[PDB]
Amino acid sequence: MMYTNDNRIVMTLDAGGTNFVFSAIQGGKEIADPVVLPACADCLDKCLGNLVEGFKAIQAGLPEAPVAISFAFPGPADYQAGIIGDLPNFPSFRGGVALGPFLEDIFGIPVFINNDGSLFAYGEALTGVLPEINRRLREAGSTKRYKNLLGVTLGTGFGAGVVIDGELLRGDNAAGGYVWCLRNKKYPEYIVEESVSIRAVMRVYAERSGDAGARTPKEIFEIAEGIRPGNREAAIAAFEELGEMAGDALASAITLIDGLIVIGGGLSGASKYILPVLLKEMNAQTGMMQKEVYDLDEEKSFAGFARGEAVEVLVPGTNRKVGYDPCKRIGVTFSKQGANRSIAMGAYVFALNHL
Amino acid sequence: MMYTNDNRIVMTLDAGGTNFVFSAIQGGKEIADPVVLPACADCLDKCLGNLVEGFKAIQAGLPEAPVAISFAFPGPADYQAGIIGDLPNFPSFRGGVALGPFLEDIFGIPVFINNDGSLFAYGEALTGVLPEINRRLREAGSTKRYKNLLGVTLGTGFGAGVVIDGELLRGDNAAGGYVWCLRNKKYPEYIVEESVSIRAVMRVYAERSGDAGARTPKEIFEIAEGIRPGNREAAIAAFEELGEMAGDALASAITLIDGLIVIGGGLSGASKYILPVLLKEMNAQTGMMQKEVYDLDEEKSFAGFARGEAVEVLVPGTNRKVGYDPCKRIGVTFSKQGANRSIAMGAYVFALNHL
């Protein structure tokens, strides 16, 4: 319930794909009748002009005046500078478009642009799971608190973002926290996204079964779940196989970050089949070593996560005691809020913290 | 030349191995006749008592009084809390020793304990290469400045530390920035340290040649370099082979950090044979992708690193221009200062920044 009673309004935008959807956020709520305009990608001045119209449209129907505007944008881009690079799906963008400063001029207030993965992790760090986990620890009587979060979206791609005690890990090339291009475990010549995405689910089921028909991951989930007819053993492998690679990637990524992992996105509907194999892999890899990964979504598992091996040690010579837990542990949890909510909140809160 | 004229004194300690060597640092200089006492590891109270004696010894022969004391310590440990875990080479340490607070009581001033890898990266970030690189960029007329550093020591092990714009990446289990336990490329069932260490150099040369005699990496370097007699082709492979794995690890590690890499340690004497294959691997992996790794130690290479594809873009509608460089690039450099100096400085500067 963070920021639930805040009066400050941030205008936002969803450039997910095909067109622009402009909105506004006050408190945690969406308080603007959305405005849909097309993104005339072929004419820089045309869509750049729609953006102005889109935001002007919203602004005109607000109670108070807006304090800023932030949104996620396709990229690659120099996000901090707010200037976007050569996007494939936007031909009028080759060269470098100073989108951030442009809007900042036409509206005066500051604008913040970031990529999906970043806003998702940020959202979960300050609004989603990270706070829930930390209180649930204190509530469980543990002295341990986690400040580092690696959020990853399983969907069209294998996006991700990294937050270090509130500070979004941007990277020196605006490319911090990438996990999609790590080396693939079962396909050394390719990247992990090739086995961790909607493609991989669809592709594997097609291979494991003899069905060459177009199936959606939901349909595949239904086949594995026993509702829809098909090759159940194959429908499962489709998700297990993804878990295995995701796990391998997450394992080596989290080794550097050393924090909790949040997973979300479209494919998160198949927690049931992904998480087990994923966790099995993470614990096989950090087992070579002194580090356990717990299923933060099951009670029994979270219980051992909370307490670990906590004790008190006496300060030699003194009568004082100090807290200590030699048990190094990590965890994985799926977003309860949903990637869409966390991303929007991420944009909202990021705005408010960086005014 | 950072802190060269600072009057503030920090007492330090080298618990490298076998015994304790106490010293003190003022400005950048070592201003204390070192004091060597044994580490009576078998008796907690005995060596814990030597530490007190060791520091008391130094303190008594200083001009002004000391402002703090920091040093690196073996671990695993809760470094931030200053309490050390069950060390293998210290039997009187099983349970959890609140070493930090102990000294903090007997001396009043604050004490900071960290692991080698961390202090090394910190040292290089504020004292070593990172500042040299950034000025050399400005001097070259580039607008780009790097704030994220991944420092790794090639030696007895494959240690490492990560600094994000001045903030040491500690991790939630005091295990941030580990790269030693990543998966090994050519030996999937083992960790990378197994192929990146003094062992791997010695081991490979023994395998590639038929020489079962004990050779030191220096001797092996001399064989590859043509001075010492032996199997030159094998002596090279010994170092190339290490470069390959180090590169693979560095590649996937730096993908999350997105900053410059500093290498140091004992084996750094063989830059000549390691760096080329190492860089070749990093550019093969981030090539699957939009990201180049440059040899920051060669002039021609650094030149292209500095300029990249820098331009100015006009803010649409305005008469103003904004800087932009779509060229995402990274680099690798060997420590000019030496791991020993950077580590000591890291301890010194870390102390002064966290008073």
DSSP string of B173-228, one letter each residue = TS-TT--TTSBPSS-TTSBGGGTSSHHHHHHHHHHHSS--S---HHHHHHHHHTSS
Report whether the peptide linkage leading into residue A101 is cis, meaning its omega lies within 30 degrees of zero: no
For B7, other C-beta atoms within 10 Å of its C-beta total: 9
For residue A305 the two structure tokens come to 């996560």
The reply to whether residue B248 touches residue A102, judged by beta carbons under 8 angstroms, is no
How many Cα neighbours within 13 Å face the side chain of A169? 34
Nearest chain A CA: its distance from B325 CA (Å): 8
Chain CA centroid to CA B267, Å = 13
For B40, other C-beta atoms within 10 Å of its C-beta total: 17
Question: Rounded CA gap, B198 and B216, in Å?
Answer: 8
Which CATH number is B274's domain given?
Answer: 3.30.420.40
Question: Rounded CA gap, A171 and A155, in Å?
Answer: 23
A61 close to A33: Cβ distance less than 8 angstroms: yes
Report H helices in B11-98: 44-59
Residue B299 CA: distances (Å) to CA of B136, B158, B280: 11, 28, 18
The reply to whether residue B181 touches residue A317, judged by beta carbons under 8 angstroms, is no
Q: Are residues B199 and B64 in the same domain?
A: no
Contacts of B113 in chain A (CB under 8 A): none
Contacts of B69 (CB under 8 A, 6+ apart): B10, B11, B12, B13, B55, B103, B107, B109, B110, B111, B112, B351
B55 close to B103: Cβ distance less than 8 angstroms: yes
A158 close to A199: Cβ distance less than 8 angstroms: no
Q: Are residues B29 and B76 in the same domain?
A: yes
Question: Rounded CA gap, B103 and B99, in Å?
Answer: 6
Q: Quick one: angle between helices B129-139 and B299-307, nearest 10?
A: 70
Q: Are residues B280 and B302 in the same domain?
A: yes
Contacts of B56 (CB under 8 A, 6+ apart): none
What angle (nearest 5°) sits at the alpha carbon of residue A148, between those of residues A142 and A196? Answer: 115
Contacts of A95 (CB under 8 A, 6+ apart): A86, B313
B83 close to B303: Cβ distance less than 8 angstroms: no
For residue B123 the two structure tokens come to 């040292």
Strand partners, A330: A293
Nearest partner of A265 among A73, A114, A120, A163, judged by Cα: A120
Q: What is the DSSP string of B276-341?
A: HHHHHHHHHHTT----EEEETTSHHHHHHHHHTT-EEEE-TTSS-EEEE----EEEEEE-SS-HHH
Integer Rg of chain B from CA: 22
Burial label for B300, CB within 10 Å (0-12, 13-18, 19+), is exposed
Question: Rounded CA gap, B275 and B240, in Å?
Answer: 8
Q: Is B86 on the interface with A (CB under 8 A)?
A: yes
Question: Rounded CA gap, A121 and A343, in Å?
Answer: 8
What angle (nearest 5°) sits at the alpha carbon of residue B257, between those of residues B295 and B243? Answer: 40
Query: Which run of H or E residues covers position A236?
Result: helix A232-257
Q: Are residues A27 and A86 in the same domain?
A: yes
Query: Which run of H or E residues covers position B12?
Result: strand B9-17
Question: Rounded CA gap, B7 and B3, in Å?
Answer: 9
Contacts of B320 (CB under 8 A, 6+ apart): A101, B314
Q: For A21-27, which contacts have Cβ atoms below 8 Å and span 24 or more sequence positions?
A: A22/A54, A22/A55, A22/A57, A22/A58, A23/A58, A24/A58, A24/A62, A24/A66, A25/A344, A25/A347, A25/A348, A27/A3
Q: End of a domain among B46, B79, B114?
A: B114
For residue A303 the two structure tokens come to 């219980």
Question: Rounded CA gap, A312 and B77, in Å?
Answer: 14
Instruction: Write out A255-308 in H/E/C secondary structure.
Output: HHHCCEEEEECHHHHHHHHHHHHHHHHHHHHCCCCCCEEEECCCHHHHHHHHHC
The reply to whether residue B102 touches residue A315, judged by beta carbons under 8 angstroms, is yes
- Counted residue by residue, chain A has a size of 355
Chain CA centroid to CA A135, Å = 21
Q: Which residues of chain A come before a gap where C and the next N are over 2.5 Å apart?
A: 289
DSSP-assigned letter for residue A212: -
A&B contacts, CB < 8 Å? 200
What angle (nearest 5°) sits at the alpha carbon of residue B331, between those of residues B326 and B335? Answer: 155
DSSP-assigned letter for residue B267: G
The single-letter code of the amino acid at B221 is: F
Q: End of a domain among A114, A137, A172?
A: A114
For B301, other C-beta atoms within 10 Å of its C-beta total: 15
Q: End of a domain among A55, A90, A114?
A: A114
Contacts of B182 in chain A (CB under 8 A): 252, 255
DSSP-assigned letter for residue A318: S
B140 SS3 class: coil
Query: Which run of H or E residues covers position A342?
Result: helix A339-353
**Rounded to 5 degrees, what are φ and ψ at A258?**
60, 60
DSSP-assigned letter for residue B259: S
Q: Are residues A34 and A88 in the same domain?
A: yes
Q: For B223-229, which contacts have Cβ atoms below 8 Å and span 24 or more sequence positions?
A: B224/B270, B224/B273, B225/B272
Method for structure elucidation: X-ray
Q: Are residues B82 and B136 in the same domain?
A: no
Q: Are residues A119 and A107 in the same domain?
A: no
B347 SS3 class: helix
How many Cα neighbours within 13 Å face the side chain of B57? 18
**Residue with token string 């500690």:** B170
Nearest chain A CA: its distance from B286 CA (Å): 7
The single-letter code of the amino acid at A209 is: S
Nearest residue, CB atoms, A258 vs list B97, B167, B171:
B171
Question: Rounded CA gap, A112 and A167, in Å?
Answer: 15
Query: Which run of H or E residues covers position A243?
Result: helix A232-257
Handedness of CA A180, B293, B159, A188 (dihedral sign): positive
Q: Is B102 on the interface with A (CB under 8 A)?
A: yes
The reply to whether residue A289 touches residue B317, judged by beta carbons under 8 angstroms, is no
Contacts of A170 in chain B (CB under 8 A): 258
Question: Rounded CA gap, B309 and B323, in Å?
Answer: 11
Q: Are residues A79 and A217 in the same domain?
A: no
Integer Rg of chain A from CA: 22
Q: Is B148 on the interface with A (CB under 8 A)?
A: yes
Contacts of A115 (CB under 8 A, 6+ apart): A72, A73, A74, A75, A77, A79, A159, A161
For residue A15 the two structure tokens come to 């450039």
What angle (nearest 5°) sits at the alpha carbon of residue B347, between those of residues B341 and B349? Answer: 95
For A14, other C-beta atoms within 10 Å of its C-beta total: 18
A204 close to A237: Cβ distance less than 8 angstroms: yes
For B53, other C-beta atoms within 10 Å of its C-beta total: 13
A261 close to A279: Cβ distance less than 8 angstroms: no
The reply to whether residue A313 touches residue B191, judged by beta carbons under 8 angstroms, is no
Contacts of A160 (CB under 8 A, 6+ apart): A117, A121, A150, A151, A152, A153, A177, A178, A179, A180, A253
Q: What is the DSSP string of A52-98?
A: HHHHHHHHTT-SS---EEEEE--SSEETTTTEE---TT-GGGTT-B-
Nearest partner of A191 among A179, A204, A208, judged by Cα: A179
Nearest chain A CA: its distance from B173 CA (Å): 5
Q: Are residues A33 and A143 in the same domain?
A: no
Contacts of A146 in chain B (CB under 8 A): 172
Chain CA centroid to CA B19, Å = 22
B345 SS3 class: helix
Instruction: Write out A9-31 in H/E/C secondary structure.
Output: EEEEEEEEECEEEEEEEECCEEC
Q: Which domain holds residue A28?
A: 3-114
Burial label for B6, CB within 10 Å (0-12, 13-18, 19+), is middle
The reply to whether residue B255 touches residue A178, judged by beta carbons under 8 angstroms, is yes
Strand partners, B295: B332
Question: Rounded CA gap, A355 and A122, in Å?
Answer: 16
Q: What is the DSSP string of B88-100?
A: TT-GGGTT-B-HH
The domain total for chain A is 2
Nearest residue, CB atoms, A317 vs list B105, B182, B315:
B105
Resolution in angstroms comes to: 3.0
Contacts of B2 (CB under 8 A, 6+ apart): B28, B126, B127, B131, B349
Burial label for B219, CB within 10 Å (0-12, 13-18, 19+), is middle
Q: Are residues B57 and B165 in the same domain?
A: no
For residue B178 the two structure tokens come to 């580990």
Contacts of B239 (CB under 8 A, 6+ apart): B201, B220, B221, B224, B267, B270, B273, B274, B277
The single-letter code of the amino acid at B302 is: F
Residue A121 CA: distances (Å) to CA of A118, A310, A335: 5, 29, 10
Nearest partner of A157 among A197, A189, A185, A130, judged by Cα: A197
- Counted residue by residue, chain B has a size of 355
Contacts of A79 in chain B (CB under 8 A): none
For A177, other C-beta atoms within 10 Å of its C-beta total: 27
Q: Are residues A52 and A164 in the same domain?
A: no
Query: Which run of H or E residues covers position B235?
Result: helix B232-257
The reply to whether residue A256 touches residue B314, judged by beta carbons under 8 angstroms, is no
The single-letter code of the amino acid at B332 is: V
For residue B321 the two structure tokens come to 């221009």
Question: Rounded CA gap, A290 and A328, in Å?
Answer: 7
**Residue with token string 């935008």:** A13
Nearest chain A CA: its distance from B49 CA (Å): 10
Strand partners, A13: A22
Q: Are residues B224 and B131 in the same domain?
A: yes
**Residue with token string 């919203």:** A58
Report whether the peptide linkage leading into residue A316 is cis, meaning its omega lies within 30 degrees of zero: no
Residue B8 CA: distances (Å) to CA of A341, B24, B31, B63, B110: 50, 10, 11, 11, 13
Question: Rounded CA gap, B52 and B49, in Å?
Answer: 5
For residue A58 the two structure tokens come to 């919203």
